[PDB]
Amino acid sequence: QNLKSTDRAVQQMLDKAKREGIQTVWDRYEAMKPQCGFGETGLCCRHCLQGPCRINPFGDEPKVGICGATAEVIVARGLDRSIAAGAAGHSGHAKHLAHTLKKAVQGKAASYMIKDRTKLHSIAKRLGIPTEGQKDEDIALEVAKAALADFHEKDTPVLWVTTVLPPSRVKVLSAHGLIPAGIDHEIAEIMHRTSMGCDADAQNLLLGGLRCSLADLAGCYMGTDLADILFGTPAPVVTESNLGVLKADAVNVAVHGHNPVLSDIIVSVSKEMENEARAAGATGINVVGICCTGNEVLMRHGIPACTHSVSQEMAMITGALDAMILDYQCIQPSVATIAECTGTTVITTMEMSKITGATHVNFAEEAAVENAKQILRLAIDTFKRRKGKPVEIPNIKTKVVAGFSTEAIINALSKLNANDPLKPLIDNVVNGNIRGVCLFAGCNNVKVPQDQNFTTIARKLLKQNVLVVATGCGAGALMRHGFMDPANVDELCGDGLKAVLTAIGEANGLGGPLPPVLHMGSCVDNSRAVALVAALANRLGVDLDRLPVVASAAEWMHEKAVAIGTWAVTIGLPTHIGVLPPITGSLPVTQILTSSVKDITGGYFIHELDPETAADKLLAAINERRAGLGLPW
Amino acid sequence: QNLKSTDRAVQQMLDKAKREGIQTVWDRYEAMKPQCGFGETGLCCRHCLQGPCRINPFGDEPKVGICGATAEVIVARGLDRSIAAGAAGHSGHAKHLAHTLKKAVQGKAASYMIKDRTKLHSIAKRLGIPTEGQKDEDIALEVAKAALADFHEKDTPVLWVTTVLPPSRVKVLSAHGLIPAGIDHEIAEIMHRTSMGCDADAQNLLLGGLRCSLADLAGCYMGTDLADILFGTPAPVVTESNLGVLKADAVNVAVHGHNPVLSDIIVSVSKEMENEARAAGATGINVVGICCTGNEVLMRHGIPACTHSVSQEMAMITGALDAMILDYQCIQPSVATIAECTGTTVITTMEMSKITGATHVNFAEEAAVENAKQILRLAIDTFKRRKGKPVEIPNIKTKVVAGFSTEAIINALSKLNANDPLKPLIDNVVNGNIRGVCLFAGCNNVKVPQDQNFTTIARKLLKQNVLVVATGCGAGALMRHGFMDPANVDELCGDGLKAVLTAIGEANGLGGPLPPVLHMGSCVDNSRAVALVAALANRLGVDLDRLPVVASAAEWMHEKAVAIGTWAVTIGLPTHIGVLPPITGSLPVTQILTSSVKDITGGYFIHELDPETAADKLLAAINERRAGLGLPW
Ligand code: SF4
Ligand code: SF4
Ligand code: FES
Ligand code: FES
Ligand SMILES: [Fe+3]
Ligand SMILES: [Fe+3]
Missing domain, CATH: 1.20.1270.30 (Substrate Binding Domain Of Dnak; Chain:A; Domain 2)
Incomplete structure (x- = not known):
């Protein structure tokens, strides 16, 4: 299973799914191989009914689309x-x-x-x-x-x-x-x-x-x-992550999707129905997070994160997930069929995102609280049905410090310099205690052993004194492997970065450092990283493409992630990606995206599937930016 | 060549292209066969970077997308x-x-x-x-x-x-x-x-x-x-169509694309530079139309239509097309490379629609006239360069009566009943002189011998007294085969329809009938057909799904045509399509689109590749509507 995921809790559920005959995202991937090479290279077009058209990457015809499209x-x-x-x-x-x-x-x-x-x-x-x-x-x-x-x-x-x-x-x-x-x-x-x-x-x-x-x-x-x-704007929070946050004795309710307009209400209402959960034999309602909706309520309320992205089905394989409350984006529709075998109640809430076989509750803001109670009452029923069944929750979780909105980061820095909070950070970039900043963003992808690129790259960058911030399922990968636990600063961080995280943490009355990686929130909260580095640019009087700041969508999957990587390039960042998008079939397009776009925006994509090489390339990009500022490196 | 196009002028240029080694849309189609069956059936997904995913239409795995998408x-x-x-x-x-x-x-x-x-x-x-x-x-x-x-x-x-x-x-x-x-x-x-x-x-x-x-x-x-x-709203016009409208002695300028914001200016300005064209040795500037921009200026100004859709490259193969002025949509990008061999100046004008190898002129409304003169002066240069070269313009054209906006149709009918113009039309539907109404719409498609479905279906419907209206390249196909020439009413039309077209034409002081098919304009002017049948519905006090009105996208290609066919169904019309869209890989989806959507909108798709069968099915749909109104049929 370690070829499928580096997460040990996910490996344990993959073993359970195998002996129970439950097909997983990894099984469906295996059943897809070999994947189509025209699609993988981008040399396929279905934009009109004269298609489908394809172009052979090499060799003889077809060389051009039917309309003449190259x-x-x-x-x-x-x-x-x-x-x-x-x-x-x-x-x-x-x-x-x-x-x-x-x-x-x-x-x-x-x-x-x-x-x-x-x-x-x-x-x-x-x-x-x-x-x-x-x-x-x-x-x-x-x-x-x-x-x-x-x-x-x-x-x-x-x-x-x-x-x-x-x-x-x-x-x-x-x-x-x-x-x-x-x-x-x-x-x-x-x-x-x-x-x-x-x-x-x-x-x-x-x-x-x-x-x-x-x-x-x-x-x-x-x-x-x-x-x-x-x-509410997030502020630092302490919580836990991975499947061990599920509780066999509680009503386990996952909020899953992206928009927390309902899940934030789910969190507050769940507190009220504790007694109603107790009447059915539960200790209470245990709300846990999956994907970015989980990140939203983790950042604001310390809701523990259960799992993320590619491994989302394994939360149900435990047998202890009583409900999965869905809004939209990144929900594997397989959850609706897996629910038949695991007993989970899968509930959709948004008119334009339904899944056949899932129960639908038409959420409306006007009726948000009543909807939450109806949804939570379906979960309480489901807990009752699994009275006296065995569940297999892996006893595996990590400690997670999170809540680093840009406001929170600036406030933390302000304890070192009240009237010029960005200056202590820039001071430590200039003197080399911070080599640069790297944003980890985006998804997991079944093509990549889960989390392997995020953790391999993050480990090398941290040793080299890079300040690492993370969002979305990049934050999910790093949190599930201990990168948001300040106890791991000694193991993970170079001496310069350790000095800075310690100084900031001690000035915030912590007795210890900030965590090795700063969780900046959900995928839309990549915007928070932009606000931070834009503020840094404005304080230095330069543009983003002169700062030692890079991004890594190390295992990306979704069209949303392609958009994010592209605007990271457009605002001037060197942007590593760890799964090739369908562009290799055009050398001119690949050359624009990896080289000549530098002349337009100063940013560029770094295509590198090997994560040790990716880390070296990201360090090189950071160090080149350092040189352009006249800094040592 | 008659397997490629039923248009004899197109066949002649296909012979010229073959002996000159110029690759055509039909050659590129042949080089694409066999086309991908996953794409053709719709069982392919590239909506994330875990793909491409495919599903075998029948047999073993893969049966489901990697995320679980069915x-x-x-x-x-x-x-x-x-x-x-x-x-x-x-x-x-x-x-x-x-x-x-x-x-x-x-x-x-x-x-x-x-x-x-x-x-x-x-x-x-x-x-x-x-x-x-x-x-x-x-x-x-x-x-x-x-x-x-x-x-x-x-x-x-x-x-x-x-x-x-x-x-x-x-x-x-x-x-x-x-x-x-x-x-x-x-x-x-x-x-x-x-x-x-x-x-x-x-x-x-x-x-x-x-x-x-x-x-x-x-x-x-x-x-x-x-x-x-x-x-200006179109009113009846007389002009010509097919490649014979090109003139070896003139500066031949094609307006091509969809938006006539510039080509309408091209038409008016070209009149002014006649003397400047004469100074270079031309009789004048001969503006001709391709595709819907051509339809726009045909409807408003009687500009002759040169060709349409799939055969657009053959206008350049004549050697006599001095310029092709492009705005956007349905332009085969092959025209930019074919121009190198035919001498044509291909000019793009719209910021978001450029073609590599074509000259670009940044049109702006503020400067519309100056742009037109610069563009037309490039054409006059090009005419000069082909002084004393042989051109091969097929001596093939038809007469075209057009300009039947809905206002024009209502005005024509008003000569039979001034204060209730729709009543004479409804009178003749009720008494059987008009069996029903069929709208022909949409493209040609290289998969179908050009125009074969439009003409085969139109011939059968006209014999059965169906009032036929047409837009876009459906109008283009019918006009190039004589269906807009009133001299062909005796040959083409059943006795009832002939009686009505004659009565209307004679009341409009014509001495003869309206043409066999009423040209209602460009693709956006399918909206005119909606206005006409909506007016008919409102005068009868019923909805569109009770009128004997159908549509046929007999050779459709573009995503725009898929949209049109779908809203024809949504507003209540039985809608024939002559090329299967990528839906056959899902029987449940095919069943919704061809049957159960009737219960939602009253309209439905009629999938029929064989045009004689399609005509029988369209007649059946018309006659069922007649029965639901209690009319004989
Ligand atoms: S390459 Fe051109 S002809 Fe082929 S599907 Fe795409 S748009 Fe249509
Ligand atoms: S079927 Fe699912 S996993 Fe496959 S490409 Fe589409 S969205 Fe991605
Ligand atoms: S030919 Fe496989 S993606 Fe189209
Ligand atoms: S597998 Fe051919 S269209 Fe994707
Ligand atoms: Fe996610
Ligand atoms: Fe067209």
């Missing part, structure tokens, strides 16, 4: 549509939160409210919305209206791009025509230009993709902003 | 993305026209203006925009603003759906949750729900697709509305 065009069109789909996911998420905030402050959804007034006012100031003499609900109404207006064309560009990046970066992007005009406008324009008989120039197509990736960045940043207003 | 889900997600891409094309077109109208009436683009004041005022009344006491430019500004607002969520649904369909139809659709909230909103939501780990229920997915197809209908109707305001 390899370069077919590859760039497919990539562009992946970016648009990712942008559609992150901005559907943000749009939902914008409608929720509007409903809350219009008196139409009383379970939601302005919880972070300070964040509301700073966002309003950032957008140019007046606050002086204005009532909070009216400021919030204007912020929500501004968020919805960024989805379409108007007299301004997308403000959740132009107001969140360094001004010099906005100017570079504007010069190349890369600033999005509207989030859904850009998504639709990608879909149009990539349809048959439209854009057929690789460079033109890819420039469109870069602009659409910034529409995705806007949706991410808007989602984080709105979630913080509604549910 | 055949039903994979097929429905792929179809939904095709619909969204089509909606993105038609509404990108309409959005461009909305910005052009706004610029024109703000004094920023003086080459554009309100040409159809009556249409402006009727659209404003339809939208609920006040006209009394308002200045035309202010009414137009409000109409343009309303058009742009339909792209995003707001306090009303998409008005270019809810105000253009019969009220009973809007109620049926609203009950099923099918009314779009915003055009680009629906496109983005499709892209989101079809991304990995999201919607995984075939019925839910397909309902989303139906709603997105109505977003496409809105873009079509908005595009026709705005084009008529800016350039």
